[PDB]
Amino acid sequence: QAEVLHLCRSLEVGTVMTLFYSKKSQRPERKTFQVKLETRQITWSRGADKIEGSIDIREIKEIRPGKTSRDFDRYQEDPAFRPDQSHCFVILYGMEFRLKTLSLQATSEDEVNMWIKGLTWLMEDTLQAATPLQIERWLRKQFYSVDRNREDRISAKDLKNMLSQVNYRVPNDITYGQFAQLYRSLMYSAQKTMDLPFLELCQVSLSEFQQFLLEYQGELWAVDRLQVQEFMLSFLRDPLREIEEPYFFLDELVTFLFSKENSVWNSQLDAVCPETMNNPLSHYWISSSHNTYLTGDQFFSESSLEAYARCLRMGCRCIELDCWDGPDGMPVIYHGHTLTTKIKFSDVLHTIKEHAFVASEYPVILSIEDHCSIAQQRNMAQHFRKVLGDTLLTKPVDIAADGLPSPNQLKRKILIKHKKLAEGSAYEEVPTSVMYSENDISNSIKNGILYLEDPVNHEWYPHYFVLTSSKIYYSEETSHSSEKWFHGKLGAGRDGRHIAERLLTEYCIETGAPDGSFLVRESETFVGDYTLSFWRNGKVQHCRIHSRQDAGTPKFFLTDNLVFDSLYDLITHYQQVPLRCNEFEMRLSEPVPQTNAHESKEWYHASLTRAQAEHMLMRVPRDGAFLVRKRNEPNSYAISFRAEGKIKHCRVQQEGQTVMLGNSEFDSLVDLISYYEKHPLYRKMKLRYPINEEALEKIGSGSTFKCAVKALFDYKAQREDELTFTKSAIIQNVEKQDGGWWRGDYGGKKQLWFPSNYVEEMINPAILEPEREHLDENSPLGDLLRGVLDVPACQIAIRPEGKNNRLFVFSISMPSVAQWSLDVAADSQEELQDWVKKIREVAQTADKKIALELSELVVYCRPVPFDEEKIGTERACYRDMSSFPETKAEKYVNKAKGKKFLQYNRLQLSRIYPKGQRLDSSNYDPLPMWICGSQLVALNFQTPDKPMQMNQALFMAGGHCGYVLQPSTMRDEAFDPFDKSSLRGLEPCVICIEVLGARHLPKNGRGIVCPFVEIEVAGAEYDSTKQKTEFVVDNGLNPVWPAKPFHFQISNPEFAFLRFVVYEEDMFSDQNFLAQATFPVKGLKTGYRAVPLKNNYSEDLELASLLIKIDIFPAK
């Protein structure tokens, strides 16, 4: 303790260290770093006084000594930026799979050691701070993000804009102390509705609270008043009011109801139970990762050492290595036949050794998919033995055993899963006869990234292409005049003067602007000069700013006043010292902002009906085409856009200085549209193509290969190199150039020139969207599939001169569809020749040695071909294992075969992994595999979908040690996941839940969420069901919900999960994930329980929680 109070102050003051930037463009610079300790943040900026970056300490995952980060590795050949590893350390922090990294370099060794021990103590202390102190640091954090820290107070409009940033909409000056009391009074006021039968500020005593924990919460220990007293003081952590008998204010009780100290999840179950770790390994569910090296999708994402660290530190116990021959005798790890980056086998092994047992004592299994040559396999084996040492399992635990060893017997051991040689042989036995080629990226002629021209904006975008022996699958696309005070020309006469006075008047009255607030415009009367307007005593004042180009140098001046070299210098001067105009003395104060910059934008039409907008946008064959139209009522607009081949509209309202869309508020139409070019507005669609007349006239015209054009007029050749033709003639093989002249073939003459405005280009059908209602759902691209080409019906030609700034282009055409063609670009000449050659070959078709040194390391986890007939017999070997891609496993976890699979899994390991078509790294449902006793159910840990949320829920029992004992009831001969009658007299469970409110729900975009909660039980099919509440309007900070009691009945509570998902109902009646919590049903507490909420990666959201009334029968 005393050491910690001395250590915090040290880092409070801070240090200077150079910072290696994750962005590729940026190069290392120095800043200065400190810990606020009242917000528990790390801050840094330029010099000793500013703020330029921040890190929440509650988000820190790992503080890592050394220079091991990709930020450091970017400059590791640059002699200027090759530091010494002792001088460095890395903070890995965040709430997604890919952590953020602060990669810092301090000179002394002991600055690093102090920071590591400092941040480490704070890291733990912040994570376990009791809820009032966490709420305290949150309020501090919101306050220090506005005009506070300078005048110590904040505006009532700066307070409005802050509450909307934390999901609260006020229907219509203060310091931090009044700010906190405001928040406290607001949360209690908003949710005083809740049924809460056990219930201004009133006081509840030590007696009252103890009575609560016993009659309503089932906390039997609370018959001891002293424990209840130590509980309340453990909540408040107020040193004051501790000598006196503890109490809760009435709003303090409601905050306790929402807090993690009141979680429905019994934290006693976060501990490992060693008593349950004595069955054979086959009896356990084992946390398992698929292609662990990958950070994103299966085709182009980066392989990272950090993913092994992250997965291991999430409690995963089975990880995967795809090993290929590497450049220097040492294997690289990457996903074969794809563009995922390569990492080295030695760096992977040191990462595994480093992090294997940080999160758990229990054994790690390395599943190795091996394509290496024998020699490099041999270096693998030598490296395993040398680096892992006695960590490596290298001989059986028990040579007389008839079952796998227990997790306890394998603690701190790492096991190797690899093909094992037949004893005395040099090939592995391969009794696997599946020439059903899977049709994935593993079994294809060529895979790669190629570029397709957008027909609306004519940019090139990347797409995943896969050529099989019959088809090509291509995917969806992958991965002074600027001055606020210068309003330019507002009109030609009195209208311009009236426009300035309206802008200035409205801005001043609406915002309570100060005197001196001003704008500048081009003079309506004195050509070349400007007029200045500023507010003084509720009246507008106008002043001429003269402009003279005598002596060839710009001279600007107000009448009878000083001379300046630019408009900007004049305005900047008079913002500091007063001007004298209309005989007043005034200083120039606030620039009035322009509210009408949308008027000159491509996407804006002052006069457009809804039908006209639909007609324009239906001509754009891509989603995300859009415009804004003014409407017939004042202060009213609409956005019109294309999504899924349909047209949508939504109203935009101007209210003074802001604009409103749904409940999302913006400064202006321009800032609105600018926001939805960067963030999605409908589903995943951003606004991409602004439609006006010019954009419509330019759609599709990228055609280059045997293009026909229709003659609009008769043309008689005025020269010998010129084409003669009649109106409506079809001119073929047209070479298109700018300058108004094209080349083409007509009436016997070849490649003769004609005026390009005398013809229209024939539509290229390839520019239209492919009909996706009958696309193969299981092509090698999975759900990323956009279009299929039937290769023998195509032909391909290189265009040597390239196209449109792409140098390497070929053209896919179909002889039997005139005018159809795709220009397809590659990144290199070699990549171009390889595609053309392999595609043409496909068109003209109408039709494993293993190194002993490595085989020796496979003790258990020995892959064999799956032998269904060996199950239940003396032939079955507990050391052998088999593997099932998702679709094969689906054939053994159904009503017919599931019991057989359960019998296999009691003795032997089975591994499940996703189907290769899931190129998007999505995940299959793990529960059907688990409920038949499969142990190694490999999911993509990088993907934040429901299967990974179930995985982390399941392994939450045991604190993510990664091994959960399967319940004995389902290692019974009788158990049948598709027949609840085999459960015999296993007692069921009835859960009744009322969702009372929520606090601190996260935002999804700029608006205010309208949240509902879906409550789900997941388990056997006979137990799985969903229910949901209504949604409430415009409140994510403290909503409450109508009375709507839910009932669930669970015949098998030993395999059942309770799941809460908070969704928003958005402005389009779409449902969007906001937060979730999933729990095994066995560890549920009853009464009025908080549901602490997590994000889609299962990482704890700050303060976000539900309050529920949950009652479970039969009573404990």
- Calpha distance 1089→995 (Å, rounded): 10
At 460, is the secondary structure helix, strand, or coil?
Answer: strand
Q: What is the CATH number of domain 494-574?
A: 3.30.505.10
Instruction: Check the annotation: does 147 bind a ligand.
Output: yes
Distance CA 921, CA 938 (A): 12
Cβ-count burial of 400 within 10 angstroms (0-12 exposed, 13-18 middle, 19+ buried)? exposed
Is 521 annotated for ligand binding?
A: no
Q: Is 407 helix (H, G, I), strand (E, B) or coil?
A: coil
Side-chain half-sphere exposure of 916, counting CA atoms within 13 A: 15
- With H, G, I as helix, E, B as strand and everything else as coil, classify residue 1068: coil
CA–CA gap between residue 615 and residue 976 (Å, rounded):
58
CATH number of 603-691: 3.40.50.2000, 3.20.10.10, 3.30.505.10, 3.20.20.70? Answer: 3.30.505.10
Instruction: Choose the CATH number for 980-1113 among 3.40.50.10070, 3.90.950.10, 1.20.120.530, 2.60.40.150.
Output: 2.60.40.150
Edge-to-edge strands, sheet with 785-790: 785-790, 471-477, 460-467, 446-453, 821-826, 808-813, 795-799
| Superfamily the domain 274-430+851-971 falls into | Phosphatidylinositol (PI) phosphodiesterase (3.20.20.190)
For residue 907, which of 937, 882, 931, 930 has the smallest C-alpha distance? Answer: 882
- Measure CA of the first residue to CA of the last residue in the chain; give whole Å: 40
**Is the separation of the CB atoms in 956 and 272 below 8 Å?**
no
Domain 708-761 has CATH 3.40.30.10: no
DSSP alpha helices (H): ranges in 405-516? 494-511
CA distances (Å), origin 697, targets 196, 455, 694, 738, 894: 64, 11, 5, 16, 56
Helices and strands, number each (H, E), in the chain: 23, 51
Answer yes or no: is 158 a known binding residue: yes
CB 123 within 8 A of CB 106: no
Residues composing the chain: 1116
Task: Tell me whether strands 604-605 and 625-630 are parallel, antiparallel or unpaired.
Answer: parallel
Q: What is the 3-state secondary structure (H, E, C) of 747-807?
A: CCEEEEEEEHHHEEECCCHHHCCCCCCCCCCCCCCHHHEEEEEEHHHCEEEEECCCECCEC
How far apart, in whole angstroms, are the C-alpha atoms of residue 507 and residue 657?
7
Cβ atoms < 10 Å from Cβ of 135 = 22
Residue 151 in marked binding region: yes
**Which of 946, 952, 1049 has its CA nearest to residue 993?**
1049
- Give the H or E element holding residue 365: strand 364-370
Give the C-alpha separation, 675 to 665, whole Å: 11
> 525 and 489 in contact (C-beta within 8 Å)?
no
The single residue listed with the structure tokens 């946008």 is 617
CATH topology of domain 2-128: PH-domain like (2.30.29)
| Structure's resolution in angstroms | 2.6
Dump strand ranges (E) for 539-597: 539-548, 555-558
> What is the C-alpha separation between 109 and 39, in angstroms, rounded?
27
DSSP one-letter code for 1003: P
Report the distance separating Cα 626 and Cα 603, nearest Å: 7
Tokens found for residue 778:
């299981």
Q: How far apart are CA 831 and CA 839, in angstroms?
A: 12
- Of 87, 335, 355, 418, the catalytic one is 335
Q: Of the candidates 279, 235, 240, which has an alpha carbon nearest to the alpha carbon of residue 257? A: 235
CA neighbours closer than 13 Å in the CB half-sphere of residue 1101: 23
**Phi, psi dihedral angles at 38 (to 5 degrees):** -100, -25
Same topology, domains 274-430+851-971 and 980-1113? Answer is: no
**Structure tokens given for 548:** 């003279």
CA distance 103 to 922: 31
Cα separation, 749 vs 536, whole angstroms: 77
Residue 638's alpha-carbon distances to 56, 651, 656, 1006, in angstroms, are 40, 4, 17, 18
The two structure tokens encoding residue 703? 């055609």
Distance (Å, rounded) from C-alpha 636 to C-alpha 619?
A: 25
Instruction: Please tell me the distance from the alpha carbon of residue 534 to that of residue 514, in angstroms, as a whole number.
Output: 10
State the Cα–Cα distance between residues 15 and 195, nearest whole angstrom: 52
The beta-strand segments (E) located in 516-602 are 518-522, 530-536, 539-548, 555-558
Residue 198 CA to residue 687 CA, distance in Å, equals 51
Residue among 923, 922, 840, 915 nearest 440 (CA): 915
For residue 5, give the amino acid letter.
L
Q: What's the token pair of residue 304?
A: 């990272």
Q: Give bridge partners of residue 1084 from the DSSP assignment.
A: 265
Closest CA to 825 of 836, 815, 816: 836
Instruction: State how far the Cα of 628 lies from the Cα of 607, in Å rounded to an integer.
Output: 10
Instruction: Examine the residue annotation and report whether 6 is marked as an active-site residue of this protein.
Output: no
Tokens 């009788």 belong to residue: 974
- C-beta pairs of 525-532 under 8 Å, 24+ apart in sequence: 530/556, 530/567, 531/497, 531/500, 532/558, 532/581
Nearest to 564 by CA among 553, 580, 575: 553
- 418 classed as catalytic: no
Domain assignments of the chain as residue spans, ordered by start: 2-128, 274-430+851-971, 494-574, 603-691, 708-761, 980-1113
Catalytic option among 87, 283, 290, 463: 290
Known binding residue 111? Answer is: no
DSSP result, 805-824: TBSEEEEEE-TTSTT-EEEE
> Which residues are 1106's β-sheet partners?
998, 1091
Residue 1056's DSSP bridge partners are 1019
Closest listed residue to residue 378, CA positions, set 848, 859, 854: 854
Look up residue 969 and give its two tokens.
């009831």
By what method was this entry solved? X-ray
* CA–CA separation, 155 and 159 (whole Å): 6
